[PDB]
Amino acid sequence: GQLRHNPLDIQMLSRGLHEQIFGQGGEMPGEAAVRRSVEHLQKHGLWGQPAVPLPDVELRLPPLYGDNLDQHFRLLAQKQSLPYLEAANLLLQAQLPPKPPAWAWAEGWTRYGPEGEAVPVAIPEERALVFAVAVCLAEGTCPTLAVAISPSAWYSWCSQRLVEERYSWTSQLSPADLIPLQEQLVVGHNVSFDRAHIREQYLIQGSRMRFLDTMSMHMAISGLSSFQRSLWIAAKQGEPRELFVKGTMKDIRENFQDLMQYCAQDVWATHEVFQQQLPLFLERCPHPVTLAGMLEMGVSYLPVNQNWERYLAEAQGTYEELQREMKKSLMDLANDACQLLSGERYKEDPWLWDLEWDLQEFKQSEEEEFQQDVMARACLQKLKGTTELLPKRPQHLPGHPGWYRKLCPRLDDPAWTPGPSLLSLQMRVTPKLMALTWDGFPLHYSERHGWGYLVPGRRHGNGPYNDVDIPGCWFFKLPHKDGNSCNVGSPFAKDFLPKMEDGTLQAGPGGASGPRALEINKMISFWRNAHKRISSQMVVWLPRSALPRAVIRHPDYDEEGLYGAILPQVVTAGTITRRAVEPTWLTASNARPDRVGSELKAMVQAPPGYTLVGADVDSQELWIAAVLGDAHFAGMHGCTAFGWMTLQGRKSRGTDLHSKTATTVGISREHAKIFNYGRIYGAGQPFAERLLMQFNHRLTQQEAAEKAQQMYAATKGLRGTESEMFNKLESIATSDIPRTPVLGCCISRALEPSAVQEEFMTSRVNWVVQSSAVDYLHLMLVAMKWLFEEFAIDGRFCISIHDEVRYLVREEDRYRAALALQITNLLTRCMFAYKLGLNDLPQSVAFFSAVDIDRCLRKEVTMDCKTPSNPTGMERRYGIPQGEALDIYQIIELTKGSLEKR
Amino acid sequence: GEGSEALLEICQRRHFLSGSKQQLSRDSLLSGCHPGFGPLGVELRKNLAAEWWTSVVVFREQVFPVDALHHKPGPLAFRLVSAETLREILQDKELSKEQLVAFLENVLKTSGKLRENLLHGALEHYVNCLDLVNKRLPYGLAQIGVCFHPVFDTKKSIGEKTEASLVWFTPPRTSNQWLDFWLRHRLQWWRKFAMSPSNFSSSDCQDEEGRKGNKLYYNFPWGKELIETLWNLGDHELLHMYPGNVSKLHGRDGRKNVVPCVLSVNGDLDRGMLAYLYDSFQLNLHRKVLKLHPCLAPIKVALDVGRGPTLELRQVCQGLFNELLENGISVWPGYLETMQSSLEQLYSKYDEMSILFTVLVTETTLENGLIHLRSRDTTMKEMMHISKLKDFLIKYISSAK
Amino acid sequence: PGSGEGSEALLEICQRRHFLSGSKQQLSRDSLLSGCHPGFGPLGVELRKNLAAEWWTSVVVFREQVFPVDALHHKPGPLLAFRLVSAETLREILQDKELSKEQLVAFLENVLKTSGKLRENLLHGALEHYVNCLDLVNKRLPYGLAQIGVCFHPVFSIGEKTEASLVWFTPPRTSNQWLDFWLRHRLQWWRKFAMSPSNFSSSDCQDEEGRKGNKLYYNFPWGKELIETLWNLGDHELLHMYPGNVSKLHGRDGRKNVVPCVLSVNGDLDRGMLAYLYDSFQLTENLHRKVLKLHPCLAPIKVALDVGRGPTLELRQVCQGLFNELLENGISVWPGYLETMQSSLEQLYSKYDEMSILFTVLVTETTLENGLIHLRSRDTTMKEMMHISKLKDFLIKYISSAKNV
DNA sequence: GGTCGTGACTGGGAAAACCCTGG
DNA sequence: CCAGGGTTTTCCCAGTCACGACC
């Protein structure tokens, strides 16, 4: 029947599906190899467990255009990249005309030939373009100057505000102040900014112009890691850009010639380096899958509307209210300390006993009632006349404790407010007024040796300071992000933020207002860190004339307002592993009621008539590491105990490594995930020691070191469960060119072992898995584009947030789109199998648990993003209907396995 | 809940809520059937009303406040029966059973009712105020006053609650926009004068006809109480209040003539007054001091005197009192206290009473230039000349925001 | 004759300018007098609020022995005005005819004996709070309580009128002295704002119980009407409310402790409001210029706003800035520049005088040039130019100079 | 590792002040 | 006795030091 199993009796792919994908031929491991595998799995003790068979899939898959699967995908990628490959070949043979002698002050585009003559041009139509824009941040979000060298002639784009003098235009932002650029490819340095300036990537219909980033290809060919580039900058040590930002508009119109010369030199040099390294980019990325996936990734599109405006404005306003409350709370504590002066009671407090409290001395008939009142008032004003004494400069509140004066505004200053209005959260009197406790002991500050804690023991330890002769209490320095050799600043630090979460720093006395500013700070940490980034987004508001008729004919369009787009200015290849790293959008954060303005994802909502299909690629990197270990063990699925745990693993049943590590060590879920990831990423024994030191401190250095050694003796074995993957990566590192198992695309030359030898292993160990993830995302986007072009299915790539992938689709094709995604995932796993020589595939691994279809962006379709800045939620303030989740069986039941519209 | 009762004995002792301990029960104060407030409580009600009047009518252009009659006249809560007619009916022994029954039925069918919801007042004055505003929309009519409510006693009773209401007549296109705006503004008003506005909460409720409004509460030490309500009642009530043609019942929004809409606010100011009382007192040596915010505390300046030249000292104190009174501040004339109490006990009494500053006029004021000044917030002394001191106080009030 | 027609024209202005609201059928002099009117308009609400503020400044502010009290709108039972009735119980009882005539009368009495009352005066709340206030002030007789608020009375319907009540607990010896003081202060305060102080007529009187007091009247063209009354109470009221130990009701002057005499000062506010509305009405030379010249301390809105010819947005910005500046300084305003269909300048002046606006402010492009604005007075209608940086101080000075004089 | 924020330590001409003094 | 000189004494703009968000 359709149900079939491996020799390890794990539910593999269905016979029909395996016949459709693999073609012909079934395999089995060798007798000595399978005996070794049986003995090894019996050694680990995980052998001999049941497995409930999942229902199979009987689907007539679409035919594969090619007998070999990898060759068929390579042909598909070549077909996708063919116009852009031809444009890149034209850019290789592109001629650079000499420097024009003049640069016209014309609005929009101006052409300058070999003689530099002025030609009025509207839309330059080169097949290949090299681009660089200049951004005028002094005039809002409007750039000014853009260059375009070409095989024919120079092109200059001058903004509308550059030619005009000052002038008033419409508010907010519109694409009318943006560049209006057969398919075309634009290659340049940070073409994300250019795309933010290019009008042709804002309509919901999509376009055909694509962009190649010389930053991306530069990181693919010759890039550096964080520590390597930092050390290179440190060893290297031993004006127009700043002026252009501060140029407003007149001074930009002043120094035009030198800035244009700088731009021409930069464009020429970048083009020269690009055309030198474009064969390097071609050979170092032999698959056209790389080019096609990068071109699909660099056109990431986000839809927004007026409600995102609310998520900006209200959140900042909300922050203001919260900020106000924080100040008020601090002031209350300050007032309390005044009472401690009474009877020198402050000479007994554990926290507030080392400040400047000493008082400052002071230096030097109706006629009856009418007559009485006038005489009394006259005597009052005569007493008011006694003003020819006392110091003309007033003493700033004498008698009070001196630090309370230091927190108070001077009486003469016009920025005066009642109470200690000058107090901020970061003053040295803030923690002492908070009466902070570090696990049963008070804090203590010294300018000599930073912050620590006093324990009534003098008459275990953490950084002993026997020099600090505090009477009766030993002083132990507070832990820092950089060990005991550094000093901690204000205790309200980012690195102390997790320590704030698990009750390692609580006030206690003053049970309401003491532990309240702590909660406010822990709430406003996110918005305080990211408000500049979120406010700096260049939202572009789409006019209705170029909007699609799908929303225009739909009654759900909001005619009173407008819609718009956010283009993620995300570096596609911005890591050593070219992982999509961007600190604002692609960060691993989710909406909670305990982070202020944490509904950043929640305003990415589809236009009417449209939806978003999301695939959470669960255990992507985990399965990549597991399948590398299994391939290096015996070349099957579940070869190792870790591989079988990957095949047979349920979080509800606890059969994962996470529950076992939580039982063995005693850390949190996130701590276990980070530890297992870093060990997968290649954490060393000192890395494990500092990772355990970063977590809960119920142990010492010796106990944590012994537990780390015992943990190292289990998973890696005598180097066990996963060391075959490590030996695979070592065999990759032993080669002259480090080639990935998935694609063979070599990493940047900084990590080549010719000048490094057996060093910096951890970065490459992470890099193999992350490059496999890059290939996974590229293959997923390639398969989505291929099935869209194959079955005429609408849609657009929305975003690829590291692990998850969101696609912007139209409504009427949603299930059909979801169906394609299912097959795509299978093929992706199959391609990984076809890039590891595996002769089979499990049933459960090839399919995700579910695929989500929604009208708004979120991790799951059950959370409404209840936050302090969105208190009612999406279901009340915005009325957004919740999403739906589907499985392969539900998709098949809804679509009947049909590949076309019914 | 001893501190809640310990606050109550302070609120009874220092003349905030009138009555005795037996009626000092939570339901009696919370249910609007309270036995009355003290003089300082009345001044706190007046301060809350003044701040509401600034926030609602003064700083908003389109709000034209109106006053509707106290009782709703018949035909048609509670009903009213005159004593004279009852006496005439009862004294007429010639009356039979049937005539008395007919009189009682007529009374039940022709009885006015003391009002509960002030929406009907705006629904009565809407046409006149539409003539007033020259058909400028949106707008609204505001009013503060005491309303009358049934008491659902578990042991008839009438509970008197002071309510501030406004009916924002708005275009229907921008209804929920104004609803969110007014929720934000009024929650900011209820959070403006608080020690801990986290105890002020917000929730939303849905009417039976699909209308949605927001509800505000305060985290009392025994559970929430409803402090304000909102209900966008649409246009059913106004249409019901004027059947027939819609020629009068219309308005202009921009260039489009549209039927208006109904928004409502119901603010129980007595509930908020007790709420702010519980916000002021928050439960080392304890110091029973009510920390009211320096805009709603009923008496600002405290003025006293010492032993010595009582004629000249009394002249100076009386002049200072009149000078401060001419500048709008309110002072507690404590200088007439011939019964010499200690400065500790005097300060304790004047700090339970939520007084901003205590000014002490000694003989040294008649010597060179100096008066003592102790702040409630810090309980630390200060010296000042008289001529500066007045301005200090007024800018302190001006720095409340 | 024509005076009543002019008063009706004033009432039609009150309908037009929203001082007094109602209908032409409701325009009856006694209907205004008793309190049968459907209620004053918003400008009348502002007039009443200013009058109440003036009263509160007069009485409770500048006295160290007068404290504010607030008596409830109901008096609970069983008691000795209408009667508060819970309706549902009465309806359910009326549903039965089985009970005979005697049973019906008896249960009507049983309900009646447990029936609360809407109040008639404001005395009884202060009388109940006398024990607490005597404990508060340490018996330093005399001392007073006060309340401004509405009271309901029957008309041969139920009419509500806002009145001001001051209760004076005085030693019996100083009774006539404090009575004369309060009478003189009250008469002067009522004569303070009107154009013709001789019309306020004060007459002494004594009741059937030998209770001395005084009565204030204002002279409408249809005769005299009551504005304010003063009375004595004696000493049986405190014993009636609090029978028992008299020393617990004793207050001290010097060392002598006595049961204090009670004096009542009770005055209508809405009838005096109508009287001042009549007072402000003048005809300045078939129809003359109707000027509603209220006193500046009692006028509803002080300073209006207008726009000139030129830039719409810039003039609106200037008017909005002046509006906000006057809002912060605390002067009542009238932002009525929003009329696109404008009338004549003479008609605009007449309209703003019909609202009894004190001064008319006009803003042109010359304000953008130098900051001067046109300012029209009320009585003489003189048009001057004043800079925009001192108009708020000028109006503050006008209010304060009227207050001082 | 390097860069630009915030807040503590301090410190030197100066504005007023005190003590003493010349005439 | 009224202005001026020697010494106090902070005072306030300014510099100088450290560590935490960012590149």
**Any strand D atom closer than 7 Å to A392 CB:** yes
* CA distances to A716, B177, B358, C271 from B350, in Å: 74, 46, 8, 41
Assigned fold of A81-301: Nucleotidyltransferase; domain 5 (3.30.420)
Nearest to B378 among A338, A345, A386 (CB): A338
Tokens of A462: 């953490």
Q: What number of H helices and E strands is found in chain C?
A: 13, 20
**Interface subset of B 281-300, CB within 8 angstroms of C:** none
| Strand pairing class (C306-307; B225-230) | unpaired
Q: Which of B297, B305, B244 is nearest to B273 (CA)?
A: B297
**Residues of C whose CB is below 8 A from B61:** 323, 335
Radius of gyration of the CA atoms of chain A, in A: 33
Cα–Cα dist A728/A725, whole Å: 5
| Strand pairing class (A450-455; A443-446) | antiparallel
| Strand pairing class (C372-376; C383-387) | antiparallel
Contact A688, A673 (CB under 8 A): no
Q: What number of H helices and E strands is found in chain B?
A: 13, 16
The experimental resolution of this structure, in angstroms, equals 4.2
User: Would you call A835 helix, strand, or coil by DSSP?
Assistant: coil
Nearest to B42 among C40, C69, C81 (CB): C69
Distance of CA A431 to the CA centre of its chain: 32
Cα–Cα dist B209/B190, whole Å: 29
Q: Which of A286, B131, A198, A158 is nearest to C16 (CA)?
A: B131
Tokens of A276: 């030198």
Q: What angle separates helix C101-112 from helix C87-94, to the nearest 10 degrees? A: 170
Distance of CA A774 to the CA centre of its chain: 16
Cα–Cα dist C208/C304, whole Å: 53
HEC string of A146-176 equals EEEECCCCEEEEECHHHHCCCCCCCCCCCHH
Best mutation target, B184, B314, B378, B381, to test chain A (most A CBs within 10 A):
B378
Contact A31, A52 (CB under 8 A): no
Assess B383–C contact: CB distance below 8 Å, yes or no: no
Cα–Cα dist B211/B205, whole Å: 9
How many Cα atoms occupy the beta-carbon half-sphere of A277 within 13 Å? 21
Tokens of A598: 């944490």
Q: How many CB atoms lie within 10 A of CB B121?
A: 21
Number of Cβ pairs < 8 A linking chain A and chain B? 87
Q: Which of A174, A598, A528 is nearest to A320 (CA)?
A: A528
Cα–Cα dist A828/A634, whole Å: 21
Cα–Cα dist B205/C313, whole Å: 41
Query: Which sequence spans correspond to the domains of chain C?
Result: 2-73+119-279, 301-404
Q: Shortest CA–C1' contact from A529: which nucleotide?
A: E21
* CA distances to A413, B63, B144, B193 from B57, in Å: 33, 5, 11, 19
**Residues of B whose CB is below 8 A from C72:** 36, 160
End-to-end CA distance of chain C: 36
The burial of B127, by beta-carbon neighbours within 10 Å (0-12 exposed, 13-18 middle, 19 or more buried), is given as: middle
Cα–Cα dist C85/B80, whole Å: 6
Contact C259, C238 (CB under 8 A): yes
Cα–Cα dist B232/B239, whole Å: 15
**Any strand D atom closer than 7 Å to A428 CB:** yes
Best mutation target, A386, A403, A523, to test chain B (most B CBs within 10 A):
A386
Residues 6+ apart with CB under 8 A from A262: A240
Q: For residue B329, is it left (φ>0), alpha (ψ between -120 and 50) or beta? A: beta
Tokens of A331: 């002031």
Cα–Cα dist B17/B19, whole Å: 7
* CA distances to C66, C129, C131, C137 from C249, in Å: 18, 12, 7, 13
Beta bridge partners of B139: B169
CATH class held by domain B299-398: alpha beta
The burial of A450, by beta-carbon neighbours within 10 Å (0-12 exposed, 13-18 middle, 19 or more buried), is given as: middle
* CA distances to A41, C311, C312, C372, C388 from C366, in Å: 96, 12, 14, 7, 11
Contact C315, C64 (CB under 8 A): no
Assess C125–B contact: CB distance below 8 Å, yes or no: yes
Contact A145, A133 (CB under 8 A): yes
User: Would you call A471 helix, strand, or coil by DSSP?
Assistant: coil
8 Å CB contact of A387 and B369: yes
CA to C1' distance (Å), from B364 to E1: 30
Cα–Cα dist A740/A732, whole Å: 8
Residues 6+ apart with CB under 8 A from B375: B356, B357, B382
Q: Look up the CATH number of domain B2-70+115-280.
A: 3.30.930.10
Distance from CA of A426 to the nearest CA of B (A): 21
Beta bridge partners of C203: C215
Contact A743, A719 (CB under 8 A): no
- Across the beta sheet with C383-387, what order do the strands follow? C306-307, C360-363, C372-376, C383-387
The burial of A431, by beta-carbon neighbours within 10 Å (0-12 exposed, 13-18 middle, 19 or more buried), is given as: buried
Contact A109, A155 (CB under 8 A): yes
The beta-strand segments (E) located in A654-752 are none
* CA distances to A85, B268, B280 from B292, in Å: 75, 19, 5
Return the H-helix or E-strand segment holding A307.
helix A306-339
Note every long-range contact of C317-325, with CB atoms under 8 Å and residues 24 or more positions apart, other chains counting: C318/C363, C318/C367, C318/C368, C318/C388, C319/C363, C322/C361, C322/C363, C322/C388, C322/C391, C323/B61, C325/C392
How many Cα atoms occupy the beta-carbon half-sphere of A343 within 13 Å? 5
Cα–Cα dist A228/A748, whole Å: 12
Q: How many CB atoms lie within 10 A of CB B317?
A: 24
Q: How many CB atoms lie within 10 A of CB A115?
A: 11
Contact A247, A255 (CB under 8 A): yes
Cα–Cα dist B208/B229, whole Å: 16
What is the phi/psi pair of residue A887, to 5°?
-110, 180
* CA distances to B101, B157, C107 from C89, in Å: 15, 13, 12
Nearest to B204 among A384, A513, A876 (CB): A876
Give strand D nucleotides closer than 7 A to any protein Cβ. 1-2, 6-9, 16-18
Beta bridge partners of C212: C206
8 Å CB contact of B81 and C86: no
Assess B204–C contact: CB distance below 8 Å, yes or no: no
Chain B positions with Cβ closer than 8 Å to A: 173, 180, 188, 191, 195-198, 202, 204, 212, 282, 284-285, 287, 294, 312, 315-316, 318-320, 322-323, 365-366, 368-370, 377-383, 385-387, 395-396, 399-400
The beta-strand segments (E) located in A741-892 are 796-801, 804-810, 851-854, 884-886
The burial of A181, by beta-carbon neighbours within 10 Å (0-12 exposed, 13-18 middle, 19 or more buried), is given as: buried
Contact A717, A40 (CB under 8 A): no
Contact B354, B290 (CB under 8 A): yes
Would you give the DSSP letter of residue A876?
A: I
CATH 3.40.50.800 fits C301-404, yes or no: yes
Q: How many CB atoms lie within 10 A of CB C66?
A: 17
Q: Which CATH number fits domain C2-73+119-279: 3.30.930.10, 3.30.2350.10, 3.20.20.450, 3.40.50.1100?
A: 3.30.930.10
Radius of gyration of the CA atoms of chain B, in A: 26
What is the phi/psi pair of residue C241, to 5°?
-75, -40
Distance from CA of B80 to the nearest CA of C (A): 5
For residue A415, the one-letter residue type is A
Q: Please state the length of chain A.
A: 902
8 Å CB contact of B204 and A332: no
8 Å CB contact of C84 and B325: no
Segments in B54-195 forming alpha helices (H): 83-91, 97-109, 119-132, 175-192
How many Cα atoms occupy the beta-carbon half-sphere of A749 within 13 Å? 8
Distance from CA of C149 to the nearest CA of B (A): 10
Cα–Cα dist A232/B95, whole Å: 114
Q: For residue B238, is it left (φ>0), alpha (ψ between -120 and 50) or beta? A: alpha
Cα–Cα dist C294/C27, whole Å: 22
Segments in A836-901 forming alpha helices (H): 888-895
Cα–Cα dist A577/A583, whole Å: 16
Please name the residue that has the structure tokens 């100040």: A327
Q: Please state the length of chain B.
A: 401
Contact A809, A610 (CB under 8 A): yes
HEC string of C147-182 equals EEEEEEEECCCEEEEEEEEEEEEECCCCHHHHHHHH
| Strand pairing class (A185-188; A210-213) | parallel
Q: Which part of chain A is CATH 3.30.420.390?
A: 81-301
* CA distances to A507, B168, B233, B304, C70 from B41, in Å: 35, 30, 34, 23, 10
